[PDB]
Design a protein around this ligand. Sequence first.
Ligand SMILES: Nc1ncnc2c1ncn2[C@@H]1O[C@H](CSCC[C@H](N)C(=O)O)[C@@H](O)[C@H]1O
Ligand SMILES: Nc1ncnc2c1ncn2[C@@H]1O[C@H](CSCC[C@H](N)C(=O)O)[C@@H](O)[C@H]1O
Ligand SMILES: COc1ccc(C[C@@H]2NCCc3cc(OC)c(OC)cc32)cc1OC
Ligand SMILES: COc1ccc(C[C@@H]2NCCc3cc(OC)c(OC)cc32)cc1OC
Ligand SMILES: COc1ccc(C[C@H]2NCCc3cc(OC)c(OC)cc32)cc1OC
Ligand SMILES: COc1ccc(C[C@H]2NCCc3cc(OC)c(OC)cc32)cc1OC
Lengths: 348, 347
Amino acid sequence: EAVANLIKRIEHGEVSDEEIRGMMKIQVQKRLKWGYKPTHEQQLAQLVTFAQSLKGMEMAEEVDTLDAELYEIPLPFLHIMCGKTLKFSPGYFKDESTTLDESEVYMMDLYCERAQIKDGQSILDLGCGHGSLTLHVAQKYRGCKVTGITNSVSQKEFIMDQCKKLDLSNVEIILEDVTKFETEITYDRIFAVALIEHMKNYELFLKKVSTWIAQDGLLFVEHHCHKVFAYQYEPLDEDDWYTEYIFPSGTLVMSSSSILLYFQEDVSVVNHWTLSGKHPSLGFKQWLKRLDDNIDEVKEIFESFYGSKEKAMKFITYWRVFCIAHSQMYSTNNGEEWMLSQVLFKKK
Amino acid sequence: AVANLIKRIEHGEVSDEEIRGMMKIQVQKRLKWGYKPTHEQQLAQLVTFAQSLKGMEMAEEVDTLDAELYEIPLPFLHIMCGKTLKFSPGYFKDESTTLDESEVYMMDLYCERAQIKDGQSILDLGCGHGSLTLHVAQKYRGCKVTGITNSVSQKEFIMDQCKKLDLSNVEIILEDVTKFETEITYDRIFAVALIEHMKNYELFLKKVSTWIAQDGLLFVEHHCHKVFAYQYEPLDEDDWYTEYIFPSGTLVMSSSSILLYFQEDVSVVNHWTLSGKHPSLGFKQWLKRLDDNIDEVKEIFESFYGSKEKAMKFITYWRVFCIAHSQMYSTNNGEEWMLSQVLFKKK
Ligand SMILES: Nc1ncnc2c1ncn2[C@@H]1O[C@H](CSCC[C@H](N)C(=O)O)[C@@H](O)[C@H]1O
Ligand SMILES: Nc1ncnc2c1ncn2[C@@H]1O[C@H](CSCC[C@H](N)C(=O)O)[C@@H](O)[C@H]1O
Ligand SMILES: COc1ccc(C[C@@H]2NCCc3cc(OC)c(OC)cc32)cc1OC
Ligand SMILES: COc1ccc(C[C@@H]2NCCc3cc(OC)c(OC)cc32)cc1OC
Ligand SMILES: COc1ccc(C[C@H]2NCCc3cc(OC)c(OC)cc32)cc1OC
Ligand SMILES: COc1ccc(C[C@H]2NCCc3cc(OC)c(OC)cc32)cc1OC
């Protein structure tokens, strides 16, 4: 296949933004045609069969050490592309004039409302990133004790540095792989925002997390999804550049909006909401605009960090393609195909 | 005007093809009521509806006066229903599958999907005239099958069949399932077309869950709309269907995913749907058998109800019920109203 040569033309910056958008529209139509079935009997069977298949998998992929480059993101680059809180997950846009910074805070206040956060609670933020929600909650609720968990040394350093600058004493960051983490502490409220996208066996994941929920505590999960069907990211045909270009070697899963309803052995659902794909679509447009508005500094950051002009171009191109393609994907059919699912769980 | 039309109905004065036309109007209004322009709104409607059920009684307690709306004479059921008297849909392999075959196909599908193994203890909640109770008891002679009904005539019929068939592995308990208490547990529990009598599914599943033995399974079949749930409230002042078909006290049309929100005490193991073509085809067969035997049906109803007029009223009711619901379940190739089967384990 000449997928390899198309990918090399992408990596050298030879493929226009509109061509990328058009390529993604084709990929979207292929995936929708693959996933939709003529009868509900078949549609449901496909989802239940998929859910059952996850129950025999590992909780998550062991990331190859050689693929560290695909996971570490330079902080100066995130300061440019992301909003002020470095949220690595969608914002909430009240309209198309909402700013990226506003969208981050709007969404995090929505999390606090839907997760029923109250001052004084113990809070666990699983996969806390650069601390957008951990620091949001810790600043808002000075009586809360907030614990964040991340497997990234540089993320933990950044958050503890922010705690110093913001004079917060109510934040702890644990450096651990959440899939191996052993604790007997229970928490009043647990957040798992954009963490499920790293997992495969949701059953094993939620079993482990359920042991960390206190009596009468709650677990709030946000996952991006397709409205109807779930799938592993595998090439649809011999022409599939998307799966090869965007994702690392290991196999990951696109959830559906209902799939966690089938994983209620150890937690049970209190509430379940969705938000339109328009919100992530707008977010990725703002990420791309910020990248382009600061392209000279982005180049200097990546040339410095990655060690050559060629490899820098490859990674700048990757992030631009990622924003372009996923802005297009989430926009599909006025935001009613790919979207966001939020689930509130109680223990047992 | 609706009360006038209903009185026209109860006397038998409007033909069949326009009963379908009127139901198609009703269908279009319900679908327009239920569907929302966004998934956010559609889901919120379902979650809100599910929460509303948790503020209700488990089931309406049935009064003295209204026994006429629930007692169905056995000779009539022998005419209308298939050979097992299944009062729930059959499975049609094609449109030439007979009513009798559809009953057995569907009950073998229940046995497959509920993972019945010979020797298990089996509980059949709301067993009716015993279609599944007697099917399982004869197919799996090492099983002990217990059926629960609140109907004396149903219990009497089943026990008569056990005598005729020399079945020694069946027990029928005459009890209100919503009040029943026992220390016995069961490897397999069936609830086929029972939750359509329930409102607070959370209380219902909480009670049933205590009856599930270690590593046992509960199998629920409910008719439903694919997407949204609703109470049988009239849609406007031109809705005759809701007033005509349903008794006082409100019942619930479930949605295909609604029991996924009721997993406090049981956990979903599997979940299937079958299209509305199956119940649609079954109601057509019920209607055909009624019509082909109408003089005998008149004889049975005149004896039981006491007059030609009242017999005609109840005959008309059953015909309209079959016509209207064959039309309803056929909507959009059976992709609106349909059947949901859910397999639960104890949580
Ligand atoms: N096994 C694992 N253990 C711990 N953290 C993990 C992990 N797999 C992924 N993560 C972390 O999960 C996060 C997903 S990105 C989202 C971060 C944050 N929830 C936000 O919304 O901004 C990243 O911080 C990643 O480092
Ligand atoms: N509270 C209650 N206690 C016991 N039986 C009940 C009940 N409410 C309804 N039922 C019974 O539940 C049945 C619903 S009809 C279904 C009968 C059988 N499952 C079949 O598929 O043929 C009726 O037999 C009715 O008598
Ligand atoms: C649905 O909206 C979004 C979907 C995905 C994202 C980014 C996505 N999730 C977090 C982990 C993660 C990690 C990645 O590698 C470090 C990554 O590479 C593109 C992408 C992602 C961000 C989103 O909003 C900003
Ligand atoms: C979806 O397919 C069906 C739907 C409803 C039915 C009939 C419905 N369910 C059982 C209890 C029941 C009891 C009734 O009165 C005692 C009744 O009167 C119409 C109707 C019903 C029968 C069905 O198939 C035969
Ligand atoms: C769990 O979600 C993800 C986790 C990791 C990744 C890998 C991705 N991380 C950012 C940088 C980068 C650069 C690449 O090559 C320049 C590349 O090539 C494959 C992949 C990546 C993607 C994810 O979802 C899209
Ligand atoms: C639980 O599901 C049901 C239970 C009971 C009923 C009531 C119904 N039973 C059969 C005979 C009959 C006759 C009537 O008037 C001649 C009548 O008028 C309203 C209603 C009925 C309907 C149900 O679902 C449609």
